Amino acid sequence: WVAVWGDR
Amino acid sequence: MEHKYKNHLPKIHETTFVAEGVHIIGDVEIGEDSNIWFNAVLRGDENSIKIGRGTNIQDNATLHASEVYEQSPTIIGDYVTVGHNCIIHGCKIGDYSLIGMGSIILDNAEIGEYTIIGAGSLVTQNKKIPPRVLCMGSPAKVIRELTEEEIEYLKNSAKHNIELSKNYR
Amino acid sequence: MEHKYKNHLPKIHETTFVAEGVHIIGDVEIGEDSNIWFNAVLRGDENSIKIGRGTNIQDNATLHASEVYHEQSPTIIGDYVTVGHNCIIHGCKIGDYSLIGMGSIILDNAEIGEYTIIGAGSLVTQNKKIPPRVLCMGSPAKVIRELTEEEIEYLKNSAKHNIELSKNYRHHHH
Amino acid sequence: MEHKYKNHLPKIHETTFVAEGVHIIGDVEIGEDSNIWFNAVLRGDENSIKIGRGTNIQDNATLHASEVQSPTIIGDYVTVGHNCIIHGCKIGDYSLIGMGSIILDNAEIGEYTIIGAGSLVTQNKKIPPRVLCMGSPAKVIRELTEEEIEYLKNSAKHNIELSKNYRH
Amino acid sequence: MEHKYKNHLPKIHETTFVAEGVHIIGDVEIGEDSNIWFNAVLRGDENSIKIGRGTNIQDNATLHASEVYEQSPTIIGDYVTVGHNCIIHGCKIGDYSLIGMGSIILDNAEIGEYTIIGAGSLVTQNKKIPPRVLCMGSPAKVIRELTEEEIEYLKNSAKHNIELSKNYRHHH
Amino acid sequence: MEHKYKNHLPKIHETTFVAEGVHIIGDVEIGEDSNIWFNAVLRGDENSIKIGRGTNIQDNATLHASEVQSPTIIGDYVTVGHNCIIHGCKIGDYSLIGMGSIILDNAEIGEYTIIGAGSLVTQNKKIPPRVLCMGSPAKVIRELTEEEIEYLKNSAKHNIELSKNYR
Amino acid sequence: MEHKYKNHLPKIHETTFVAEGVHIIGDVEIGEDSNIWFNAVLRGDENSIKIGRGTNIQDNATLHASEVYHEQSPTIIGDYVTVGHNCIIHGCKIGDYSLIGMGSIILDNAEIGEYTIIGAGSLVTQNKKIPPRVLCMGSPAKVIRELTEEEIEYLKNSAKHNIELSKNY
Amino acid sequence: MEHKYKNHLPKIHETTFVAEGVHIIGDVEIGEDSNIWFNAVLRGDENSIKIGRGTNIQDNATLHASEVYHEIEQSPTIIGDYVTVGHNCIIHGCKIGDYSLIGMGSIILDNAEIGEYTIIGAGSLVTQNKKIPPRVLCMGSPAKVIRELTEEEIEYLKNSAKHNIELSKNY
Amino acid sequence: MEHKYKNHLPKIHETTFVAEGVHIIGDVEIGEDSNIWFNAVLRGDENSIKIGRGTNIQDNATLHASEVQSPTIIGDYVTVGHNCIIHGCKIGDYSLIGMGSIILDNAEIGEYTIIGAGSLVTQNKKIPPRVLCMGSPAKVIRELTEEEIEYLKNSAKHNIELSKNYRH
Amino acid sequence: MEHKYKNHLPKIHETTFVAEGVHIIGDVEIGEDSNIWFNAVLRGDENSIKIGRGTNIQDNATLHASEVYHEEEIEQSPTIIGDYVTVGHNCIIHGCKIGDYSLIGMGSIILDNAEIGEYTIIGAGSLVTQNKKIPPRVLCMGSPAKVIRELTEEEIEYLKNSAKHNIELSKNY
Ligand SMILES: [Mg+2]
Ligand SMILES: [Mg+2]
Ligand SMILES: [Mg+2]
Ligand code: NA
Ligand code: NA
Ligand code: NA
Ligand code: NA
Ligand code: NA
Ligand code: NA
Ligand code: NA
Ligand code: NA
Ligand code: NA
Ligand code: NA
Ligand code: NA
Ligand code: NA
Ligand code: NA
Ligand SMILES: [Zn+2]
Ligand SMILES: [Zn+2]
Ligand SMILES: [Zn+2]
Ligand SMILES: [Zn+2]
Ligand SMILES: [Zn+2]
Ligand SMILES: [Zn+2]
Ligand SMILES: [Zn+2]
Ligand SMILES: [Zn+2]
Ligand SMILES: [Zn+2]
Ligand SMILES: [Zn+2]
Ligand SMILES: [Zn+2]
Ligand SMILES: [Zn+2]
C-alpha cells in the first residue's frame, strides 16, 4: 500500500 | 499472568490493573493506573513494549513488534485508549489518543497525541498521523481536525476506564 | 469465567454452554441453549448485555457497550443469532436468526433487523439501522440486496445445528 | 488447552510449542516445530484442521470451518498473523497471512504468497503462489520480489527459534 | 454435424432437433426434445458436455471446457435456455434457468435453477449463483430474487422453444 | 442456406450477396445490394426480419426476435458488425452497429448513428439520430462530428463493392 | 473451406488443422501446427491476416481488418497464441504465447504484447497498446497486474497441449 | 537580472533578495522582504505580476500570464503576502491569497484563485477558473479540495513564512 | 548561450530570438522567427534537435533526446509551454504543448493538436492531428473545434509579435 | 556556480563536470565523475546535499530539503544521492535518499524522508510522497506513485549502463 497521502 | 522471555521480566506498576486471561511476556513496561483487559496479549519478545500512565488496553487485543537486527519498538503514551481486538504492532501512539476497536497499526507508524483512529481502521507501516485529527478507513485517511467536544471526550475516556478498573479486584 | 461487577452477577441459563477461556462479567443475561465459545469476552460493566435462546457467540469475540451519559443503547441479541469468530459487538441490537459474519464490527445504537446477514469483515457504524431480511456487507457496510427465500430458510436451519454442535461437548450416555 | 470432540483428539507433534490460553479441539493435526501462540483457538469440530511443520499460528487467531466442503489445510513454514480468522481454506508452504486477515471457505492461498494485514479473501477465491495480495476484498497486486521471497524463507524459521526461548 | 473424438461419439436423443451448421464433437449427451440451433458448437473433447431434456442452445453459441489435469465438465439441466452467441464453458446450469444472449459462463461456475442471467453478462470462474435470482453485469452481480411472473416466464420459455423447433418439420 | 418455416420462404433480392455458411430462415426479406457474410444466422421464425438496400450483416452475427412485440427492421446502407446480436429492434438508415454489440427487443436506433463495439442496447431503449452511443448498458455519449457522418455515408457502400469482388 | 479474393489464395501449412464450418478467405497465411476450430471465419479481403506457428483460433471466432487507407494495421498473430471462442480479432497485432480470453474484442491498431493474458469478455479499444507479460481485462480493458513467472510458464506449456488436442482429429 | 518590456521596468523593493539566474521582465512588482530564488523567471509582458511582502518564489519556477484579449476577462498574476511558491512551479495568471503554500512542481492556470492560508499539494494541477477556498488542503491533477486545514497546519503557514525570510538574510 | 558538442555547432537563423539564460548545445537547428525564451535548455548532444519556423520554446523548458529511437523534430508555428520536457519526440505544425507537459521518446503529435497542461505523453504514443489530448498518461479526448483550430493559427504568430518587442 | 551559505561552501570533486547556469549553494558534496547539467540548482541551505560518484543531475532540476526543526520526535532526512544515479530533467528531489544505480524519470517529484532503494526505476512524471519507502529493484510510477513490479534482468542491465553513459557524455564537453 501507499494510497494515502499523509501530509504535504 | 506474566511470562519471562530470555532475561526479561515484565515491569508492571503496583497500581496497574491486569484482568484474567491476560498474558504479558518479556520486555514489557506498564505504568501506573493502566488497565489491561480480558484476554489481551502483550508479547514483548521481538522488541520492547512500553505503556505509560492511565492507559487502557482493551479486551482480546494484541501488542507485538517485528524482529530487530531501522525498526521501531511499541511505545504507547499516557491516557491512551486501545480498543477491543486491536492489533498494535511496533508503532508509537501519543498521549490521550483513541485507537478505535478492531483497528490495526503497523510498524513504524506514529499516531499523534489527542487523535481518534476510527473503528476497524488500518494504519500501514511508516505512516505519520498528525495530532488532534480524526483518521479512519482501510487504509486509513486523515478526515478532519477534531472538534472541541471530541478533544473533551478524549480528556475523559481514559480516566473513566481507570475508575472502571478500580471497581474490579 | 463468571465475574462480579458491583452488584451484578451473570444470569446464565443452566443449559447455556460456556467454553474455556470465556469471561462473562457483571450485567449479562444469557438464554437457554445459547453457546459462548472459546476466549469470548462478554463485559457487562458499562451497560447490560442480554442474549436470547439458542444464540452462538463464537470464539475470540468481544461484547461490550459504551459508557452511559445524560441516549446509550445496551447490547441486546435476540434468539438463534450467530455472532461469528472474532466479532466486536458494541452497544447494538441484533434481531432473531441474524448472522454476523466473522470479524465484523457493530457499533453503538446500531440495529440489525431479524433474518439479516452481515458479511464477514464488515463495519456497521454508529446508529445505523439495517432492515430485516437483507444482505449487508462492506466497511462501512451498505445494504446490498434483499435475501432470497432460500437464504432466509438457511438462517432458520443455521443456529439450530450450531446448538447441537455444542451438545457434543459433554455427557456420558449420549 | 487440548479438548476432545466426539471421536477426535488433537494429534500434536511432541516438539510443537503451545502457549498458554490456547484451545485445540477435536480433529486437529499439528506437525513438528510448529508454534501456537497465546489465546489462539483451533476448533476442529465441524471439520478437520491440518497444520504442517514449522508453521506458526499467532496470538488471538481462530481456525475453524463451515458446517459440512473444504477442511482447513495449512502447509509448512506458514505464518498466520495475530488475530487472523482462517476458515476452511488451504494455505500453501512458506506463505504469510498478515495480521487481522480473514480467509473464508474453499479459498486457496498459493505457496510463498503474502496476504497483507487486514485483508479479506472471500469464499472460493484462488490466490496464486508468489504474489502480494491485499485489501478488503483482496486483490492480487504483483509478483513478490526476490527480497520478499528471501524474507518468507526466513520468516517461520525465525519464529521457530523464537519459541525455543520459552519454557515448554 | 456429428464428430468422433478419441473413442467418444455423441449420445443424441432421437427427438433432439439439430439445425444445420451445428457441430457436436466427442463426449456430448443431449436429452429428449432439446434443440440445438444454427451454427452452434458443442465440443466435448477436453471434458464431457451433458445437456438435459427440453433445453435450447441457440444460434452461434459455443460449449466447451478447459483442460482437465475439482475441474468441472459442462452440465446443463432440463428446460434451460442458452441464448444466442453465448459461451458456456465448463459450468453447471440448473433446470429452467435462462442465460441471456451474448453471455459468458466460465469454468466451475454454477448457476442455480430458475435463475436469469442478463444478456451480455460475464460469470467468472468458480462463482456460485443461487437459484431464483436475477444476475447481471460484467462481472455479473446478483441483483435480487425473481418475481412470481418471472418464474412463470421461465416455466414456459424452454417449452415454447421446443414447440418452435417441432415446426421445423423439414429438419426433423 | 435458405430454410422454410411454416408457410414462409425468404425473399432475397437477386443482387443480394449471401456468403457460404449463412442460414436464412422463414420470414426474412433482404433488399438489393445487401451483403450477408459468412456464418451469419437470420432466423425469421418468431417474427419477421426485414433488411433494406445496401445493408451489410457481418460474419457470425445473429438476427432474431422475441415470441409474439417488435419485429426486426433494418434500414438501408446499415452496417451490422461481426458477431453482433440483433434482436427484435429497429435500426435506421446509414447506422453502424459496432462489432460484438447486442441490441435487444423494441430498441430503436435512429439514422446516422454509431453504436460502439461491444455495446448492449437494452430493451425499449430509443437512441436518437446522429449520435455516438456505447457501453453496457449503452448510453448516448455525444453527437457525431462531420467526419463521422461522412464516414457513415461511405461504410455500407464500400462493403457493397467489397462483396462484388466475390466469385 | 478456402475462398479466393481477387488474386489472393490462402497460404495454409500442410500440418494446419482446419475444422469443418471454417471459412478462410483471400490473403491469409497460417503457419505449421496451427488449429482453426469449428465455424471460425478468417476473412483477409480488406487487409492481410498472418498467423504464426502452433496458434489456436477457437470456435465461432472472427478475424477481419478495416478498410485500408493508403494515405493501418493488418492482423498479425504470432506463435503459440490462443484466440478464445467467439473472439473478434480486428486489425490488431498479438505477440507470441499470448491468450485472448473467450468472447473478447480487439480493435484496429491495438497491440497485445507477448506472454499476456486478456480476460474473457474484454474490449481492447483502437490503438490500445498492452505491454508484454500482463493481465489485462474489462470493457474497456485495463492492465490489472503483471503475470507471475509461473503464470508465464503456464502460457508456454499451454498451447502446446492445444496443438496436441487437434492431433486426435 | 531585470529586463525592460515596452514602457515597463520591474518595481522591486530594495530588501527583495533576487538570486542569480533569475530573470524579471516588464510589468513586475515585488514587495518588501520577498525572495526570488535561483533560475526563477518572472515574465510580466502579457499582463502584470504583483507579489506582496515576505513571499518566496522558489528555484526554477515560472510566472507568466496568458495573452489579454479585447473581450471575458483575463486575470493578471497577483500573489499576496507571506506566500510560498514551490520549486519548479508554473504560476499562470492566477491570484494567490496571503500565507498560502503552492507545493513544488504545481501548475496554477489562468483566472484560478487560491484562498489565503491554503496548501496546494506538490505536483498538483489547478485548472482554469478554479476557485479554491481559504484554509483547505487541495491536491491532485486535476486538483480537488481534500479537507480543511488543522490549526497546526495553519500555524505552520504562519511560522514557515517568516523562516523563509531569515533564510535569505544569510545569503 | 551557444555551445559546441563534438563537431556540432547550433545553426540558428539570424531572425531567431534567443532570450537570456538560454543554453543551446550542439546539433540544434532553429528556423526563422522562432523564439526561445528565458532559461530554456536545448541540448542536442545525443541526437539532433530540429525546430521549424515561427515556433516558441517557452521559459525553463528542456529539449533533449536519448542515446543513438528518434531525435527531436518540431514543426512550424508550434507552441511549447513553460517548463515542458520535450524528449526525442516529433511535434507537428501549429500544435500547442500545454505548459508543464512531458513528451517522451518516439512519440508523435499530429499537427493542429492541443496537449493539455501537465500531461504526460508516453514513449511511442501516436497522437493524431486536430485533437485535444490530456492526462497522465495522456489520452485523446475529442476532436478540436474550428474555434480551437483558429486559436492554434494565432498562438505561435502572436508569440512572434511578442518576441519582436525585445532586444530583437 | 558556487555560493557559500553561512560557513558552508560546496565540496566538489575535481572531475565533477558542472554545466553553465548551474547553482550549487552551501553544504553540498559531489563525488568523482558526477555531472551536473544546465540550469540545475542544488540548494544546500536548510539541510545538506550529498551526491556520490558517477551520478548525473540533469537539466533544470532542483535539489532542496525542508526546514529542520531540531526536534527529536521529528525525523528529518537530508538529501542523500548514491553512486551512478540518474536524476532526470526537471526533477525535484527534496530531502530524500536515493540508492545506487537508481533512475528517477524526468519531471518526477520526491518528497522529504522518502527512500528509493538501489537499482529502482521511478517512472517519468511520478510523485513519491513524504516517508514513502520504495524497495530496491522495482518499477515505481504514478502520481502518487505505486510499486508496479520487480524489474527484469534486462532492465537492471540497462541501469548498469545509464549513468556510465552520461559520464561518457560529460567528458566530450
Ligand atoms: Mg517482475
Ligand atoms: Mg517478479
Ligand atoms: Mg518478475
Ligand atoms: Na471506537
Ligand atoms: Na447449549
Ligand atoms: Na457493557
Ligand atoms: Na476484522
Ligand atoms: Na446460533
Ligand atoms: Na487489507
Ligand atoms: Na458478448
Ligand atoms: Na431494389
Ligand atoms: Na467502437
Ligand atoms: Na506471425
Ligand atoms: Na490546458
Ligand atoms: Na488514446
Ligand atoms: Na557509498
Ligand atoms: Zn508499503
Ligand atoms: Zn507480530
Ligand atoms: Zn467498549
Ligand atoms: Zn466458523
Ligand atoms: Zn463478499
Ligand atoms: Zn474452451
Ligand atoms: Zn432470440
Ligand atoms: Zn471487419
Ligand atoms: Zn504563458
Ligand atoms: Zn510536473
Ligand atoms: Zn534526456
Ligand atoms: Zn524546498
HEC string of chain F equals: CEECECCECCEECCCCEECCCCEEEEEEEECCCCEECCCCEEEEEEEEEEECCCCEECCCCEEECCCCCCCEEECCCCEECCCCEEECCEECCCCEECCCCEECCCCEECCCCEECCCCEECCCCEECCCEEEEECCEEEEEECCHHHHHHHHHHHHHHHHHHHCCC
One-letter identity of residue G142:
K
Q: Which residues lie below 8 Å from residue E50, measured CB to CB, with a gap of 6+?
A: E28, E29, E73, E74, E75, E76
Cell of E72: 468441472
10 Å CB burial of residue H142 (0-12, 13-18, 19+) is: middle
* Shortest alpha-carbon distance between residue F59 and chain G (Å): 7
| B19: Cβ contacts below 8 Å, ≥ 6 apart | B35, B36, B37, B38, B39, B40, B59, B168, C23
Residue F73 CB contacts under 8 Å (≥ 6 apart), including other chains = F50, F89, F90, F91
Measured over the CA atoms of residue D91, residue D93, residue D95 and residue D99, the dihedral's sign is positive
Nearest to F89 by CA among F60, F48, F54: F48
| E65-68: long-range contacts, CB 8 A cutoff, minimum separation 24 | E65/E89, E65/E90, E65/E107, E66/E90, E66/E107, E67/G161
Q: Where are the alpha helices (DSSP H) in H84-136?
A: none
d(CA D12, CA D31): 7
Question: Grid coordinates 457502400 are at which residue?
Answer: F157
Whole-angstrom Cα Rg for chain I: 15
User: What is the pairing mode between strands B122-123 and B104-105?
Assistant: parallel
> Which of G21, G64, G67 is facing F82, going by the closest CB pair?
G64
Q: F114-117 — which CB contacts under 8 Å span 24+ positions?
A: F114/F144, F114/F148, F114/F152, F116/F141, F117/F81, F117/G88, F117/G105, F117/G107, F117/G123, F117/G125
Q: Which residues contact F83 (CB under 8 A, 6 or more apart)?
A: E60, E85, F58, F59, F60, F61, F99, F100, G60, G62, G86, G88
- Whole-angstrom distance, CA of residue I67 vs CA of residue I81: 25
Half-sphere exposure of F54 (CA within 13 A, CB side): 16
C-alpha cell at J19: 554545466
Q: Which three cell numbers stand for residue J82?
A: 548514491
Q: Are D45 and D66 in contact (CB under 8 A)?
A: no
Q: How far apart are CA B3 and CA B10, in angstroms?
A: 8
Grid cell 503474502 in the structure block, residue: D114
Asked whether I136 and I154 are in contact (CB, 8 A), the reply is: no
Count the neighbouring beta carbons within 10 Å of the beta carbon of residue I9.
15
G126 φ, ψ (degrees, to nearest 5): -50, 140
Q: How far is CA B45 from the centre of its chain?
A: 17
Kindly tell me the sign of the dihedral angle through the C-alpha atoms of F102, F106, F107, F108.
Answer: positive
Q: Is H159 exposed, middle or buried (0-12, 13-18, 19+ CB in 10 A)?
A: exposed
Query: How many CB pairs below 8 Å do chains B and D form together?
Result: 66
Q: What nine digits make up the cell of C131?
A: 432492515
- Closest ligand to the CA of A3: 17
* The three grid cell numbers given for residue E135, joined into one nine-digit string: 444476475
Determine the residue type at E102. Answer: G
Burial of C42-71, coded b for 16+ CB within 10 Å and e otherwise, reads: bbbbbbebbbbbbbbbbbbbbbbbbeeeee
| CA gap I38, H24 in Å, rounded | 10
Strands F35-36 and H125-126 come out as unpaired
Q: Residue B123 — φ and ψ, nearest 5°?
A: -110, 110
Task: Tally Cβ neighbours within 10 Å of residue F147.
Answer: 9
Amino acid present at F6: K
CA dist B69 and B81 (Å) reads: 30
Grid cell 452511443 in the structure block, residue: F133
Give the H or E element holding residue H120. strand H119-120
Instruction: Write out the residues of chain H at the interface with chain A, using a CB-CB cutoff of 8 A.
Output: 103, 119, 121-122, 139
C-alpha cell at J111: 518528497
Contact C73, C92 (CB under 8 A): yes
Q: Where are the alpha helices (DSSP H) in chain C?
A: 149-167
Burial of C33 (0-12, 13-18, 19+ CB in 10 A): buried
Query: Which of I18, I59, I96 is the best mutation test for H, with the most CBs of H within 10 A?
Result: I59
Residues of chain H contacting J25 with CB distance shorter than 8 Å: 38
- Beta-carbon count within 10 A of C97 CB: 26
Ligand minimally distant from the alpha carbon of residue D117: 9
Residue in this structure with the C-alpha cell 520478499, named with its chain if needed:
D148
- CA distances for B141 relative to B119, J112, J133, angstroms: 13, 19, 18
Residues 6+ apart with CB under 8 A from F146: none
Going by C-alpha positions, the residue among B131, J75, B139 that lies closest to residue H150 is B131
Method for this entry: X-ray
Nearest residue to C23 (alpha-carbon basis) of C32, F39, C5 = C5
Cell reading at B144: 478532519
Contacts of B126 in chain J (CB under 8 A): 131-133
Which ligand places an atom closest to the C-alpha of J165? 27
With residue D155 as reference, give the H or E element that holds it. helix D146-164
Which of G33, G71, G38, G72 has the alpha carbon at shortest distance from G53? Answer: G33
> Which among B135, J19, G155 is positioned nearest to H150, based on CA atoms?
B135
C-alpha to C-alpha distance for D43 and D26, rounded to whole angstroms: 7
Q: CB E11: neighbour CB atoms within 10 A?
A: 13
B83: how many CB neighbours lie within 10 A of its CB?
Answer: 24
- Give the closest ligand to the alpha carbon of residue C72: 6
Amino acid at E93: I
Chain D, nearest residue to J152 by Cα = D145
Angle at D65 between CA D62 and CA D70, to 5 degrees: 135
Paired residues of J127 in beta bridges = J109
Among candidates B86, C64, B62, which has minimal Cα distance to D39? B62
Q: Distance between CA G103 and CA F100 in Å, rounded?
A: 9
Please give the Cα distance from H145 to C96 (Å, whole number): 44
Dihedral in degrees, nearest 10, Cα atoms F98, F101, F105, F108: -20
Instruction: Please enumerate in sequence order all residues whose Cβ is within 8 A of that of J67, keeping only pairs 6 or more positions apart, or say none.
Output: H160, H163, H167, J46
DSSP state of D128: P
Q: Nearest-CA residue of chain D relative to C123?
A: D136
Q: Please provide the distance, in angstroms rounded to a whole number, between the alpha carbons at the two ends of chain D.
A: 14
Count of CB atoms situated within 10 Å of the CB of J12: 19
CB atoms within 5 A of ion ligand 12 belong to F 98, 116-117
E108 contacts E128 by C-beta, under 8 angstroms: no
Q: Is the dihedral of CA J94, J116, J158, I106 positive or negative?
A: negative
Using alpha carbons only, give the angle B13, B15, B20 rounded to the nearest 5 degrees: 90
Greatest distance between any 2 Cα atoms in chain I: 46
Q: CA-to-CA distance for F132 and F144, rounded, in angstroms?
A: 6
- Grid cell listed for C59: 470464539
3-state SS assignment for residue D164: helix
What Rg, from alpha-carbon coordinates, does chain C have?
A: 15
Cis peptide before J78 (omega within 30 of 0): no
Whole-angstrom Cα distance, residue G143 to residue D25?
Answer: 46
CB H85 within 8 A of CB H111: no
Contact B42, B23 (CB under 8 A): yes
Distance CA F45, CA F7 (A): 10
Alpha carbons C102 and D43: distance in angstroms, whole number: 14
- Report which residue type is found at G50: K
Give E73-106 as a DSSP string: -EEE-SS-EE-TT-EEES-EE-TT-EE-TT-EE-
**Distant-in-sequence, close-in-space partners of B163: CB < 8 Å, separation ≥ 6:** none
Nearest to E37 by CA among E60, E67, E3, E70: E60
Contacts of A6 in chain B (CB under 8 A): 127-129, 142
Query: If residue I153 lies in a helix (H) or strand (E), which one and from where to where?
Result: helix I146-164
Q: Are B93 and B75 in contact (CB under 8 A)?
A: yes
Identify the bridge partners of residue D74 per DSSP, sorted by sequence position: D51, D91
Q: How far apart are CA G99 and CA G78, in angstroms?
A: 11
* Bond prior to G10 in cis (omega within 30° of 0): no
d(CA I141, CA B37): 59
Among C23, C48, C26, C51, residue whose Cα is nearest residue C37: C23
CB atoms within 10 A of CB F150: 10
CB burial of residue E169 (10 Å; 0-12, 13-18, 19+): exposed
Residues of E in contact with C145 (CB under 8 A): 142-144
Domains annotated on chain E, with CATH: 2-166 (2.160.10.10)
Determine how β-strand E140-145 pairs with β-strand E133-137: antiparallel
Backbone angles phi, psi at F29, to 5 degrees: -120, 135
What's the one-letter identity of residue H58? Q
Number of alpha carbons in the 13 Å side-chain half-sphere of residue F100: 34
List the grid coordinates of H102. 503552492
CA distances from D7 to C168, D1, D27, D44, D45 (A): 10, 17, 9, 12, 10
Q: Beta-carbon neighbour count of residue H96 at 10 Å?
A: 28
**Joined grid coordinates for residue H83:** 506566500
Question: What H or E segment, with its residue span, contains residue C57?
Answer: strand C56-57
Q: Do A6 and B129 touch (CB under 8 A)?
A: yes
Note if the bond before G74 is cis, omega within 30 degrees: no
Contact B128 J131 (CB under 8 A): yes
Contacts of E25 in chain G (CB under 8 A): 38
Tally of CB atoms within 10 A around I84: 30
Which cell numbers hold the place of G15? 500440418
d(CA E117, CA H94) in angstroms, rounded, equals: 54
Is B127 within 8 Å of A4 when comparing Cβ atoms? yes
Rg (CA), chain J: 15
- A6 CB neighbours in chain J (<8 A) are 129-131
Cα–Cα distance measured from residue G16 to residue G30, given in angstroms and rounded to the nearest whole number:
7
